[PDB]
XYZ file of C-alpha atoms in Angstrom:
392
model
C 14.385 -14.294 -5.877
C 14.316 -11.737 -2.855
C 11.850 -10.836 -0.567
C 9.917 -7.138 -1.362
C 9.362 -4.230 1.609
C 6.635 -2.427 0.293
C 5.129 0.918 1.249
C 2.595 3.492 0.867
C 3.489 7.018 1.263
C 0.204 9.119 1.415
C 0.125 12.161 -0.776
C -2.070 14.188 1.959
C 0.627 13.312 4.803
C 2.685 16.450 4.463
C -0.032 18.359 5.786
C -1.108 18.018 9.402
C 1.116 14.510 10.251
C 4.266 16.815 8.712
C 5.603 13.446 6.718
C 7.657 14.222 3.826
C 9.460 11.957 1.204
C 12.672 12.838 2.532
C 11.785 11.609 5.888
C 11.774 7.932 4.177
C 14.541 5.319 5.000
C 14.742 4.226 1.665
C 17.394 1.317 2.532
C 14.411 -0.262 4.209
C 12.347 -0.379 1.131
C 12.515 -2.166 -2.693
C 9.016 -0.410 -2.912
C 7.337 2.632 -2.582
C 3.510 3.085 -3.564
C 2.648 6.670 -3.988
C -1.135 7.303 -3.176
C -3.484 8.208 -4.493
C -4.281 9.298 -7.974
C -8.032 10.018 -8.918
C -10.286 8.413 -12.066
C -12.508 10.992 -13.868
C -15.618 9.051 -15.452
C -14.203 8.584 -18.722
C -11.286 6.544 -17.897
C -8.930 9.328 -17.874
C -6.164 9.098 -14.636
C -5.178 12.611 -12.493
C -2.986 13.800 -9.705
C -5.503 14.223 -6.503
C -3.254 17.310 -5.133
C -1.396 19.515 -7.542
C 0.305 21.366 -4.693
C 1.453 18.148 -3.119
C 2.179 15.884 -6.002
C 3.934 18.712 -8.370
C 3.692 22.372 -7.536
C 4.958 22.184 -3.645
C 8.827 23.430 -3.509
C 11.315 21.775 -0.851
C 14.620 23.270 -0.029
C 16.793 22.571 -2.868
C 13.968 23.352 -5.786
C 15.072 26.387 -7.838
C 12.847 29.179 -9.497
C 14.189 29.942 -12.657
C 15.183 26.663 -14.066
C 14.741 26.441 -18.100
C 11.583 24.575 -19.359
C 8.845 22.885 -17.911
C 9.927 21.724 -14.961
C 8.429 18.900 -11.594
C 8.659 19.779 -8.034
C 6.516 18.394 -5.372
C 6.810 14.953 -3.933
C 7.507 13.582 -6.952
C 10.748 15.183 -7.779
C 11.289 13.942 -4.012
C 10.608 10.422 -5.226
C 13.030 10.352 -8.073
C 15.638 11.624 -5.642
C 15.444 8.843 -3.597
C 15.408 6.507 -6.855
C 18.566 8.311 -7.638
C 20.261 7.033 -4.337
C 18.875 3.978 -4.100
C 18.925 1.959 -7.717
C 17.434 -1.322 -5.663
C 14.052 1.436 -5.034
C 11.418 1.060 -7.235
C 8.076 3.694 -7.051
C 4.529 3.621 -8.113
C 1.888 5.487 -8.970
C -1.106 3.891 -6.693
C -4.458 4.550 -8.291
C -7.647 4.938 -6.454
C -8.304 3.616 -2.426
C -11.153 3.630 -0.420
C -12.013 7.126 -0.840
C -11.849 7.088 -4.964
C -13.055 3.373 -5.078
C -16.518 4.125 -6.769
C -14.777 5.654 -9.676
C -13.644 2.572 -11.182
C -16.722 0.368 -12.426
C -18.094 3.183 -14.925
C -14.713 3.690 -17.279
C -14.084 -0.386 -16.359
C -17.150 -1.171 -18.006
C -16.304 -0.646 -21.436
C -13.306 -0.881 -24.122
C -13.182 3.302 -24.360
C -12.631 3.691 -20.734
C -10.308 1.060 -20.028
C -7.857 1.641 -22.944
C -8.384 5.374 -21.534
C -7.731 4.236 -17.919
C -4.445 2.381 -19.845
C -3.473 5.497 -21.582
C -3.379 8.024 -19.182
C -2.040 6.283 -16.172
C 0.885 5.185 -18.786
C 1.591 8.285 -19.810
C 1.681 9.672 -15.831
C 4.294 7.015 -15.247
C 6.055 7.845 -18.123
C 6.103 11.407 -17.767
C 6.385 11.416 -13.458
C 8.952 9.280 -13.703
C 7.518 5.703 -11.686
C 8.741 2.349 -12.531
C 4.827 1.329 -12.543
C 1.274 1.616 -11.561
C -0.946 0.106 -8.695
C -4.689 -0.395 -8.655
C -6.689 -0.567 -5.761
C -9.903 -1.087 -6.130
C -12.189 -1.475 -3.102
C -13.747 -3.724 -3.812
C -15.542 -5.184 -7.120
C -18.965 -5.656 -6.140
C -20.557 -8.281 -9.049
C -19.619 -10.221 -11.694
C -19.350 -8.075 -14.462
C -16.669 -5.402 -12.030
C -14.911 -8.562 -11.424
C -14.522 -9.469 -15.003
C -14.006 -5.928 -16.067
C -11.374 -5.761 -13.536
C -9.673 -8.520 -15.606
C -9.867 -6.716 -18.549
C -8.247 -3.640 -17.162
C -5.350 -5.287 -16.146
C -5.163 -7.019 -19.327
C -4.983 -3.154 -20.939
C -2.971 -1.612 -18.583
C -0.047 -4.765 -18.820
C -0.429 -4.089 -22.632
C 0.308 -0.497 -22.637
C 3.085 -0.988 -20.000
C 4.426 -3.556 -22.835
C 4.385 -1.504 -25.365
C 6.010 1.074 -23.842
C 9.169 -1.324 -22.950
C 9.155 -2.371 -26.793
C 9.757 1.351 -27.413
C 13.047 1.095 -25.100
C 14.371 -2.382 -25.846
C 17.384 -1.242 -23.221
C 15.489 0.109 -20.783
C 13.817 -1.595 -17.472
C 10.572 -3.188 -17.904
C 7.981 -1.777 -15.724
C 5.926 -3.085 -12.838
C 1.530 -3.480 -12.645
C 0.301 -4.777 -8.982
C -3.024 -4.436 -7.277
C -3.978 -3.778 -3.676
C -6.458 -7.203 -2.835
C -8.613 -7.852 -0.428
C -8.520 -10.466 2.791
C -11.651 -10.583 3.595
C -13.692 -13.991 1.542
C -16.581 -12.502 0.417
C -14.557 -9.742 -1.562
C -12.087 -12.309 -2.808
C -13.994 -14.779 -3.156
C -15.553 -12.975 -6.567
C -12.536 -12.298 -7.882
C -11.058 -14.417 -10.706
C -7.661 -14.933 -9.085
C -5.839 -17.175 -11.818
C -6.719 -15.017 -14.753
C -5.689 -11.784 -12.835
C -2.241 -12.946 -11.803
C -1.535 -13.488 -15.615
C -1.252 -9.655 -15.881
C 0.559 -9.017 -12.067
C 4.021 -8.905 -11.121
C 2.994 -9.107 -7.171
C -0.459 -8.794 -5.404
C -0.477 -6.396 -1.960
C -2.465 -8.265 0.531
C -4.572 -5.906 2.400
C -4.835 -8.292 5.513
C -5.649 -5.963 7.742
C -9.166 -3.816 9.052
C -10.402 -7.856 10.355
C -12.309 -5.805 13.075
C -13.317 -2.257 13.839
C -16.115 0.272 14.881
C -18.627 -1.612 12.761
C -18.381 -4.703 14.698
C -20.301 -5.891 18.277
C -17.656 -7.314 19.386
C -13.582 -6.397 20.027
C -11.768 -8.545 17.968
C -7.740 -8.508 16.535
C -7.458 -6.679 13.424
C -4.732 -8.349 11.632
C -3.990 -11.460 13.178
C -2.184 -14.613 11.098
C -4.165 -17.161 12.551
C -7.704 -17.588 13.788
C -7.612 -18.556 17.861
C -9.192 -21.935 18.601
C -9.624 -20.956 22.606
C -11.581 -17.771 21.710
C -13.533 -18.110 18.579
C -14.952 -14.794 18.679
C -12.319 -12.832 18.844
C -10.876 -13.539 15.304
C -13.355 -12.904 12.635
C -10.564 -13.427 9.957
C -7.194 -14.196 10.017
C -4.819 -13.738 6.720
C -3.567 -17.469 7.110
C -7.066 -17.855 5.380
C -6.443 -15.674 2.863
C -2.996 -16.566 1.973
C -3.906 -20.347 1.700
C -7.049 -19.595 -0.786
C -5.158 -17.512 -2.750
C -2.725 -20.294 -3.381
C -5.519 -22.448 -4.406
C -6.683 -20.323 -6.809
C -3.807 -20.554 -8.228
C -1.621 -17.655 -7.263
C 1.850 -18.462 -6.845
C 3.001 -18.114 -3.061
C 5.991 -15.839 -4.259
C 3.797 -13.506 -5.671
C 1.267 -12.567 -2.329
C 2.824 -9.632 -0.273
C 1.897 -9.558 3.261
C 0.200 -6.488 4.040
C 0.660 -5.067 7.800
C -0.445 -2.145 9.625
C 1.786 0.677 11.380
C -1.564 2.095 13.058
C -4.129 0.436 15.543
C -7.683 0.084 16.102
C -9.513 0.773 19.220
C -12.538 -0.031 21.295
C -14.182 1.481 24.147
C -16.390 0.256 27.253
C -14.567 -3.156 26.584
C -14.113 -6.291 29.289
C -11.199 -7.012 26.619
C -10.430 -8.984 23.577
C -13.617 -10.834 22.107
C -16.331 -8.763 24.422
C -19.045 -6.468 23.280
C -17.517 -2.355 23.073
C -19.522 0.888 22.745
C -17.452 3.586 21.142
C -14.175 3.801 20.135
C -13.048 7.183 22.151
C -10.191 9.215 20.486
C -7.356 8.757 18.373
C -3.966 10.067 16.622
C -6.063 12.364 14.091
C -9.316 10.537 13.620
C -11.314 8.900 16.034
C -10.837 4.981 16.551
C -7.572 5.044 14.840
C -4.374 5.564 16.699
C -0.198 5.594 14.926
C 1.752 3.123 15.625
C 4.348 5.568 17.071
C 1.582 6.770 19.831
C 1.677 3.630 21.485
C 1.527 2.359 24.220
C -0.774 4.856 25.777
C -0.207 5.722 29.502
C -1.919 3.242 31.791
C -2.585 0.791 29.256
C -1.022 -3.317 29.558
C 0.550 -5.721 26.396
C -0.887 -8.275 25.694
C 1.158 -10.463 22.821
C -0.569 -13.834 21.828
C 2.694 -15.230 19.656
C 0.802 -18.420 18.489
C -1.656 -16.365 16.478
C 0.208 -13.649 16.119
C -1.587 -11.218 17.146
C -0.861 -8.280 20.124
C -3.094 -5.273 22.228
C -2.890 -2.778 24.886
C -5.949 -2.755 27.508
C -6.511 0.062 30.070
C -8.286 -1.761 33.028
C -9.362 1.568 34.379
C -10.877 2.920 31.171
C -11.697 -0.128 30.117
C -9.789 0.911 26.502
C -8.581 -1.980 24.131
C -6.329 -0.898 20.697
C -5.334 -3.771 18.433
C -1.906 -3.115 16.797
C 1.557 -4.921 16.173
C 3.937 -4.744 18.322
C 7.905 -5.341 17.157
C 7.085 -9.188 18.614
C 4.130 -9.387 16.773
C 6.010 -8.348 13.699
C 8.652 -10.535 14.162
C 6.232 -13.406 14.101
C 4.431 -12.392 10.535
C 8.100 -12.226 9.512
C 8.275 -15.954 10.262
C 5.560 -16.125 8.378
C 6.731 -14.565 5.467
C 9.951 -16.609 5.294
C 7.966 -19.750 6.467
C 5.434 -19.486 3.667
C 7.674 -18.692 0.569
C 5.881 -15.318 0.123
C 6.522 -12.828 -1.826
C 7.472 -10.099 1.187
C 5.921 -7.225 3.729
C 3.596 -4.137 2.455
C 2.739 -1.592 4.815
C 0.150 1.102 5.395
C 1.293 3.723 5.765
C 4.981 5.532 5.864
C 4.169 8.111 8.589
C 2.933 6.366 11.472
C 5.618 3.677 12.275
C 8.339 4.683 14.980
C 12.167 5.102 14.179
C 15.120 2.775 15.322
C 15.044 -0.298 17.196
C 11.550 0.008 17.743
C 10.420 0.088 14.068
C 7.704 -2.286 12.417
C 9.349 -2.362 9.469
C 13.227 -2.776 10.436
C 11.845 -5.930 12.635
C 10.407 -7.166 9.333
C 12.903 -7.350 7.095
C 15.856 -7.985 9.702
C 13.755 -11.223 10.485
C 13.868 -11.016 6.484
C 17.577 -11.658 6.423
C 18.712 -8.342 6.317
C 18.744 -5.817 3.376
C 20.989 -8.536 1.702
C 17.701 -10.844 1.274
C 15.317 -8.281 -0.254
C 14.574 -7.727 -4.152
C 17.723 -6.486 -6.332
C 16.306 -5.635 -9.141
C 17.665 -2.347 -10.670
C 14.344 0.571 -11.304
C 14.749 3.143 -14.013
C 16.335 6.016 -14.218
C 15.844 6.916 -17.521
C 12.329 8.589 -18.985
C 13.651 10.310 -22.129
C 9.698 11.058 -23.385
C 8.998 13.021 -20.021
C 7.328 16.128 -20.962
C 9.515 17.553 -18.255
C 13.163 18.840 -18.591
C 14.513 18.574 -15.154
C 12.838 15.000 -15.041
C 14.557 13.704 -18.147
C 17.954 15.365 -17.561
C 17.950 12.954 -14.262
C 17.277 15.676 -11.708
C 20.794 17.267 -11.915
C 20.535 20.734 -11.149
């Protein structure tokens, strides 16, 4: 098989950051994760943002086409599937933000076969070659074994809708998971994967404003030198997924376009107060902002890992540089995994300097990624220009 370039594309980036679908390379990508739909208590799946998701016309959308018609970003996501047959989309329920939604309707048969139903019948309909959960994070037992159940529902209703269109594609379920041990660690790994065509692993976020100390936030391996300034490394994660039982070829390697900072820092591994400023939010700065003026590199290959530190304002941000990616790409390759997710679309930079072009040129080239055909065709779509292929 081929290696998978996965990313998210945030519904709420066409606002403020001015990121639109059509400002996707989608040659870079066998994957696109569209985020985020909502859960209402009863298991029942929704758009988050009518205007964005549906109503929202680009140049090119008429007014007076027959029928119900889609506009929005997802017409913009079909019209990249329509270029590029190798790019698959899906509809990305949940996130941080919509996390607490999930253990009510996961806690019983009604609102899972719900959950099933309606998030089916939004990939049918919106035209996505499948559906991701994230879910952070399952906090007991019972969420983790409900979580099981889910995906056992959701994989059966996927089924059954690929039984209904023995020539058609079948379609994709994968899951955003966690790096961190004590989230993953109450997970039931082997039983999930049963129901998964490829996890996303989330390993990134190792360190941030809730920590003492500055540490790297998405380092591969842990540093033996400096103990401290590595609370986690996804090395870790990768190998204890394995042994769980979770085939290497399976665990996408998540990586962030976006860095972390710290403020009143010696450096990497010290105590911080603050983290000052950022791109739109404070303590969180776009890949495509850095380096900032006045700040050094630093890139430790042997872990991984890479930072920019302002001696004068004693600033430290944690982020990937192209190095830094080339090294997880090594990685990748190295390991057998299954490929490269990203979060998120908007903040990487464009050309030679790009994240994700490093990635999956240390890939192999486009030639080494995923062919596997998506679908075109969604002939129950309650929409006309969606089912007539987007001709216009």
């Amino acid at each position: 098989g081929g290696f998978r370039s996965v990313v998210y594309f945030v519904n709420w980036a066409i606002y403020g950051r001015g990121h639109n679908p059509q400002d996707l390379k989608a040659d870079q990508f066998t994957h696109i994760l569209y985020a985020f739909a909502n859960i209402r208590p009863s298991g029942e799946v929704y758009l988050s943002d009518t205007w964005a998701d549906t109503d929202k016309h680009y140049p090119g959308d008429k007014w007076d086409e027959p029928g119900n018609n889609v506009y929005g970003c997802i017409k913009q996501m079909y019209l990249l599937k329509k270029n590029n047959r190798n790019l698959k989309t899906l509809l990305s329920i949940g996130g941080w933000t919509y996390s607490p939604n999930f253990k009510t309707p996961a806690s019983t048969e009604e609102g899972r076969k719900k959950f099933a139903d309606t998030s089916l019948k939004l990939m049918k309909d919106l035209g996505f070659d499948g559906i991701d959960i994230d879910w952070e994070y399952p906090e007991d037992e019972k969420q983790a074994n409900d979580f099981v159940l889910l995906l056992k529902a959701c994989r059966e209703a996927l089924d059954a809708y690929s039984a209904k269109h023995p020539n058609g594609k079948k379609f994709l379920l994968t899951i955003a998971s966690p790096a961190g041990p004590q989230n993953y660690n109450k997970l039931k790994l082997a039983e999930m994967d049963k129901y998964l065509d490829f996890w996303n692993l989330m390993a990134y976020d190792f360190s941030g404003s809730w920590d003492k100390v500055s540490g790297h936030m998405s380092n591969v391996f842990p540093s033996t030198t400096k103990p401290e300034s590595t609370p986690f490394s996804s090395d870790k994660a990768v190998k204890d997924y394995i042994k769980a039982g979770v085939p290497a070829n399976k665990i996408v390697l998540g990586m962030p376009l976006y860095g972390r900072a710290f403020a009143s820092t010696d450096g990497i591994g010290t105590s911080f107060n603050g983290v000052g400023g950022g791109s739109w939010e404070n303590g969180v700065w776009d890949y495509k902002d850095m380096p900032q003026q006045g700040a050094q590199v630093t890139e430790l290959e042997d872990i991984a890992a890479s930072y920019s530190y302002d001696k004068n304002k004693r600033y430290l941000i944690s982020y990937d540089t192209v190095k830094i990616a080339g090294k997880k790409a090594e990685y990748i390759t190295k390991n057998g995994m299954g490929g490269g997710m990203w979060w998120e679309s908007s903040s990487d930079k464009t050309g030679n300097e790009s994240l994700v072009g490093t990635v999956v040129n240390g890939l192999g080239g486009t030639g080494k990624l995923e062919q596997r055909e998506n679908e075109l065709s969604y002939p129950e779509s309650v929409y006309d220009n969606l089912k007539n292929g987007m001709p216009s």
